[PDB]
Design a protein around this nucleic acid. Structure first.
Lengths: 86, 271, 46
RNA sequence: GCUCGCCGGAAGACCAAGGGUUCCUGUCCAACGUUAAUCGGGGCAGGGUGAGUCGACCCCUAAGGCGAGGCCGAAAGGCGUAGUCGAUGGGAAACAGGUUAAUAUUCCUGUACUUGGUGUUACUGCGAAGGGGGGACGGAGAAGGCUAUGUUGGCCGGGCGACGGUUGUCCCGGUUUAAGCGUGUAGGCUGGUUUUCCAGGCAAAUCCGGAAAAUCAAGGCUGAGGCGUGAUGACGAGGCACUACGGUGCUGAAGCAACAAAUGCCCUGCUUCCAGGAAAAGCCUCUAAGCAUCAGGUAACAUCAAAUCGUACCCCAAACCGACACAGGUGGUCAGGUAGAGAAUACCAAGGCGCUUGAGAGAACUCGGGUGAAGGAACUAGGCAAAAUGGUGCCGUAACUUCGGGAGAAGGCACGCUGAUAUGUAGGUGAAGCGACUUGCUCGUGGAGCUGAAAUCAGUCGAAGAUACCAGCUGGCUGCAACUGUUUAUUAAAAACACAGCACUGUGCAAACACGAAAGUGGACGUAUACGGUGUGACGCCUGCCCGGUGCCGGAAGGUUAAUU
RNA sequence: AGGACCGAACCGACUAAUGUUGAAAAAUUAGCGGAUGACUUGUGGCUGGGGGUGAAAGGCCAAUCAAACCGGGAGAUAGCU
């Protein structure tokens, strides 16, 4: 089991964009910023618990930092089964 | 059989092949093979320690029984094989107990023949015996120097040794160089001469033929600059000096043997 | 024409990287020198 | 937007390496961009890289590195055993459609597949750091069987012609379909099955190796492609709407056959050759210590797990390497048509471009071309440069020679189109049918169709028929080096170097010799038909004389002679 | 069969012109040579300065070579300018 604290740490923010929206309304998938070391499993469990929704699968990609000073962050494609989240 | 190639092109005009119909045409016996990576003449420091080596065809080492230890078990010759690693060529022998090994192929040996090692084997080619048991005047090959060590002498293509005398624990051998050497009579030997005596009749015919034996070109000393070789420069072809190695030791006559540990065994230095 | 610098990250790290410097005392002295001078980029290792 | 030019085995597409956000979108025009710029790889802001199956990581190893102890060496350190790393190599598995402004074998849709764990049930000998198989291998060449792919017919949808003609031996487009699963064939290879026994594989084994005996030899492995299914699916020429004029939605006909086919596959095959062609793991089998109504194994079935990381973009280039948006360099993969032997070349297709200064004029002179009357090397250091020759078939061909050459020697001649032979021939491919059978991915026979040279004869055209591009100038006499090769990156490609061969000399193995204060290592896992050094330089005919000197080799009677005492 | 032959890719580099403040710190253009080999190329490795490596040219060793580069001795020394 992944304990409560890590779940409270792995979800940073919901990623909002045209891709993120269209993903929500077509694939029923939500896009999140997650802790850079979060795992498919950790994101899955955290979403299921903290959002009380049911998830099919998680796809993750690390977005490389843009010159400025942007830090590398991980983007998560969370595919819900049927619950409406937000 | 030595065969001349017809001169359909330069580089074939002078080739003389040594073709042997009895050599096995398949692959060798895989249980007696090891990888044998080339060196280029470099030692573990990475420096060339022997010049003119490198390139050449890839070769797998065949494990050859030089010791001939299985005493009293007769063995039959299965086939004769090309061996890239010797000038001689080898024979796969099967022992009646189910073991196979490679030996140097004696002169007349051929597939189906029976060989045997021991103290009681018969005096005939291919049989390995301690030199106590071999008649004086015999022609042997693959001779040992220290008992149980393995054959080291007379082991190239057409070579052999004559057991000249037996005086106590030592036999006097006429090595192929013309040297009389004493060796303990407990050292083993094989009757006969090493086969493939025609090996020396081949003519490579072209530079590439040498290159694919791994032999790289030799630049003459006198063709270099003075900083490169003692046979230095000159305007034109100049020599004017006593010939030497690249390291300045007089070649053409000067004698380099300096071993007093084994001088006791040299009955007569070659000539 | 072919110029002298033909980059290769593997070869770079093997030839001048941090652990290659640390392998021998002479490399560790290179590192000590570069710290003493205060180099921002201590080796090629990126 | 319409034309026109250019590339097209690339200047198209796709990657690796390298780079690093250049990607896509909106704004902007200071600087940057060799000009202007409203544009941009520029500035600024926002987005974009989704994986059990692709790669990395990972299991395993090569060259090599490092290396517990160890052996060495003033120290620092060197080498190296057990080991441990290290790909450029070997180890499990996904494909087709659709999608975004930018990601797709990753998303979605359809159809799959792999490897473990965990249960449950059945049935059981399981179990190594060990053994034996396997992995697992060269070069050349020659088929055959195929496929990608093309071409043509048929089919289906549309057309009826800006100018004579054009309801047809007309015109134009489409005619696509995968992993997987079933099947097992053109090939390729080996006989098989029991029984007994053992001087082998550390020991030992039922595995493998050997030796017998019997009985069948007709048994098994492997392998493209085809075919069926996947798939009543998807796609599809087109319409038909709507519209931001970008584009989006909706519907959808035919979807076959023949021939010609790769450098791709069968094939790591086969044949030949000498130069004799990795390694280890996964894998499969055997047991050992052990475990023993257990554990494990094996099969079915269910369940779960397959993390992490790379994924944008450029990538023969304005994103890499060259200070530059530099005429240079840069590994792999794919590669259509018509001519053509071709990946040459000409022109094109898909696709991509027109090279980030332009507008005039139409001087000398410069550069890069074209053409020249009469001459024809008179030029010049020298035919430098230019011009010339060029293809295929066939005829013909000298001295000389090491018999292979020389030799495309030299020199000729026939090339187009049309018609006939023969409404297309020789040949290739091959349906129906017809029989057979050990009856289907069958064999024989038979030939529809399809493709299709080369010739001969006759006729015709232009000045000319290898009509372009493309594509040998040739002969004679000599020097030198035999030759193919190699070199002064960036003024010398040679007669130099190398070479096969030849000789001389060292060298008995702990070899000589080299690199190392050493340990060691190469030589060499080689053994005098072997290795090193040296001179010459294929081959033919040959290599005379001289040992004074100087080296080297052998002797040392005698003289002399060091430390030492 | 062949260090066979002709000829693309590929690898070279004989000749001529141009360029010489270049498009380029050695290229371009027209020809040229080899093109199954003593070949060519990718990726890694290995050899180090009196040292390597060299089919040998004093060639090559990061546009540097009769002794690399970098830092130190070192403000070497300079009857010379």
């Amino acid at each position: 089991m992944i304990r409560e604290e890590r779940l409270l740490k792995v979800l940073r923010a919901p990623h909002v964009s045209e891709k993120a929206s269209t993903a929500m309304e077509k694939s029923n998938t939500i896009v999140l910023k997650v802790a850079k070391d979060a795992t498919k499993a950790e994101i899955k469990a955290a979403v299921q618990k903290l959002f009380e929704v049911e998830v099919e699968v998680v796809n993750t990609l690390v977005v490389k930092g843009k010159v400025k000073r942007r830090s590398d962050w991980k983007k998560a494609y969370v595919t819900l089964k049927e619950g409406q989240n937000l | 059989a030595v065969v001349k190639c017809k001169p359909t092109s330069p580089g074939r005009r002078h080739v003389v092949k040594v073709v042997n119909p009895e050599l096995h045409k398949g692959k060798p016996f895989a249980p007696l093979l090891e990888k044998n990576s080339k060196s280029g003449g470099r030692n573990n420091n990475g420096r060339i320690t022997t010049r003119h080596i490198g390139g050449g065809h890839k070769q797998a080492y065949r494990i050859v029984d030089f010791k001939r230890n299985k005493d009293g078990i007769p063995a039959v010759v299965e086939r004769l094989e090309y061996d890239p690693n010797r000038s001689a060529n080898i024979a796969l022998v099967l022992y009646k107990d189910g073991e196979r090994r490679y030996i140097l192929a004696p002169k007349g040996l051929k597939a189906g023949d029976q060989i045997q090692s021991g103290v009681d084997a018969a005096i005939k080619p291919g049989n390995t015996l301690p030199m106590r048991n071999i008649p004086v005047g015999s022609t042997v090959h693959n001779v040992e120097m220290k008992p149980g060590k393995g054959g080291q002498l007379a082991r190239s293509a057409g070579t052999y040794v004559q057991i000249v005398a037996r005086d106590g624990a030592y036999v006097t051998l006429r090595l192929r160089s013309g040297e009389m050497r004493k060796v303990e009579a407990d050292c083993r030997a094989t009757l006969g001469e090493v086969g493939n005596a025609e090996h020396m009749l081949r003519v490579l015919g072209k530079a590439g033929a040498a290159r694919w034996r791994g032999v790289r070109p030799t630049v003459r000393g006198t063709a270099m600059n003075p900083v490169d070789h003692p046979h230095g420069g000159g305007e034109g072809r100049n020599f004017g000096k006593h010939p030497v190695t690249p390291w300045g030791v007089q070649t053409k006559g000067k004698k380099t043997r300096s071993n007093k540990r084994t001088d006791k065994f040299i009955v007569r230095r070659r000539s | 024409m072919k110029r002298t610098f033909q980059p290769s990250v593997l070869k770079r790290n093997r030839s001048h990287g941090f652990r290659a410097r640390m392998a021998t005392k002479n490399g560790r002295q290179v590192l000590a020198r570069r710290r003493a001078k205060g180099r921002a980029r201590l080796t090629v290792s990126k």
